[PDB]
Every structure is written in structure tokens, then in C-alpha cells.
Write a protein that binds this ligand. Structure first.
Ligand code: SAH
Length: 259
């Protein structure tokens, strides 16, 4: 059993009030009150982020931890926060975005955020059985949270396998992907194999709630995986009991228009 496994157990042991206080303590949280209502009312002329994913990917890019360029694929795009972010980047030439949709899953949000015309959305697509194609940048933000850490580990393992499939098709592609449960043993093993062949490393974004152990893998960074994970597990365990609130920051606004 790992420190991350214990983090999951203590998280599940929280009351509802404890859970709500814990998940937000010390995290950056974008102010979405305006964006939420524009989406609710059916407004399409908006560059405010369609989800909390936009600021996460923007932080990775702005830190230089990811390179978004060329033909981008967004595997598991959901509402599209990463697809709209990539499409707004001048170095990006096109985005092909895929998501399963269906009951209890987000469909793409359709807005005029800058470069929307360069995104081709496909809902109803399972990326785990879809053949890879040419891409310069491969993005994947899949990993559905569960109270069962073993299920989270298996979900994470499937994402890593998918990224190996896309690297087999595109050995030179930049890759950025969510690792939902980095502490599970089959995940560490899979990340070690990925890093051995393709380089890269893990990083925690400051927008990630303490209720998820998610870390992002990118081929553009480095670092010992086991140490990266254990540092993060210890930090999450130490935050149980902190009552400080989140740090509220403005939401990303990418502007609107075609590219
Ligand atoms: N097998 C699969 N094939 C395609 N999409 C999947 C999938 N499994 C999960 N997904 C979808 O992947 C999405 C991951 S959440 C993605 C959030 C996005 N990066 C943003 O910024 O808004 C979810 O919407 C989920 O429905």
C-alpha cells in the first residue's frame, strides 16, 4: 500500500463538509460565475473558458512544460477546454477533438472562442478503440475519479496504453496526458516504460483539487517519477485539516474569432 492509497482512504473517510473544505484548501480556482451563466443561457459568442480545464492546460503551456504545435489531437475532449485552448495558440494549425459523450458525460460546448474554426469535434467516439492517425501534439485528459483506487489505477493504465499507441503511430509527437492515479503500482510501471522510451515527467498543476491525485505527464519535462509521486502524496496527506479557502483568480478569456 502506498501513501497515495492512504490519501484515498482518508479522503473517503471524510464527511461531506470535510470533503468540501479539503478539496479546495490552498488551490487556485477560476471565477466562473459569468462563464457558467453564458453557457447556461446558450450564448455562443464568448471566449471565456468552457471548463476548468483551460486554465490547467494554459498553466502547463505558460510554464513551458508543454509544447502545443502543429496538428493537435484532443483525446477525451469533454466540453473542449483543452481544444479551445490549443486552437487559440498561433503555433497550432488544427485540432481534432474526440469524446464519448452519452449519459453522464460532457458533450463539446460550441463557442466562437478564438480559432474555433480550426477544431473538428467528434462526439460519440471511444478513443480507446480508435485507430491513431498523424499528429504533432497528442493531448489526453481522460481519467474518471472513483472512490476505488484500484479502478482509478486501471483507468489510468488504459490512458497510458492509449498514449503508447499514439506514440507508436507518431514517435516524434509531443504528448501531454492526465495521470489520474499516479501512485498505483501498474501505473508507476507503465509510466517508467513510457519515460524510458519517450522521455518526459510528471507535474502537479495548482488548479488541481486536493480531492484528486491527478498529475500531468508531458514529454517536454523530466524527473524521477517515483519521487514526483511521493512528494505529491505527502503534500496531499498534510493538507487534511487545513481550513484555508481557495485562491480565487480570474477565468481565462481567449477572445473570439476565426483563425
Ligand atoms: N473512452 C473514451 N473515449 C472518448 N472520450 C472519453 C472516454 N472516456 C472518457 N472520455 C471523456 O473524456 C473526458 C475527460 S474530461 C476532459 C476535460 C477537458 N480537457 C476540458 O478542458 O474541458 C470526459 O468528458 C469523458 O466523458
Amino acid at each position: 500500500m502506498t501513501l497515495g492509497d492512504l490519501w484515498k482512504r482518508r479522503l473517503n473517510n471524510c464527511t461531506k463538509e470535510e470533503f468540501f473544505a479539503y478539496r479546495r484548501t490552498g488551490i487556485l480556482e477560476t471565477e466562473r460565475d459569468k462563464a457558467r451563466e453564458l453557457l447556461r443561457k446558450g450564448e455562443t459568442n464568448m471566449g471565456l473558458a468552457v471548463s476548468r480545464g483551460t486554465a490547467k492546460l494554459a498553466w502547463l503551456e505558460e510554464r513551458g512544460y508543454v509544447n502545443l504545435k502543429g496538428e493537435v489531437v484532443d483525446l477525451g475532449c469533454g466540453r473542449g477546454g483543452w481544444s479551445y485552448y490549443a486552437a487559440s495558440r498561433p503555433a497550432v494549425m488544427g485540432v481534432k477533438a474526440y469524446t464519448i459523450g452519452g449519459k453522464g458525460h460532457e458533450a463539446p460546448k460550441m463557442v466562437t472562442s478564438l480559432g474555433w474554426n480550426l477544431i473538428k469535434f467528434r462526439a460519440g467516439m471511444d478513443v480507446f478503440t480508435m485507430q491513431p492517425h498523424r499528429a504533432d501534439t497528442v493531448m489526453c485528459d481522460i481519467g474518471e475519479s472513483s472512490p476505488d483506487a484500484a479502478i482509478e489505477g486501471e483507468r489510468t493504465r488504459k490512458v497510458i496504453l492509449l498514449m503508447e499507441q499514439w506514440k507508436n503511430r507518431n514517435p516524434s509527437a509531443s504528448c501531454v496526458f492526465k495521470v489520474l492515479a499516479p501512485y498505483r503500482p501498474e501505473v508507476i510501471e507503465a509510466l517508467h516504460r513510457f519515460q524510458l522510451q519517450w522521455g518526459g515527467g510528471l507535474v502537479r498543476t495548482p488548479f488541481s483539487r486536493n480531492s484528486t491525485h491527478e498529475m500531468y505527464y508531458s514529454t517536454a519535462i523530466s524527473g524521477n517519477i517515483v519521487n514526483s509521486v511521493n512528494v505529491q502524496s505527502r503534500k496531499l496527506l498534510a493538507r487534511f485539516g487545513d481550513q484555508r479557502g481557495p485562491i480565487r483568480v480570474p477565468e481565462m478569456d481567449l477572445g473570439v474569432g476565426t483563425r
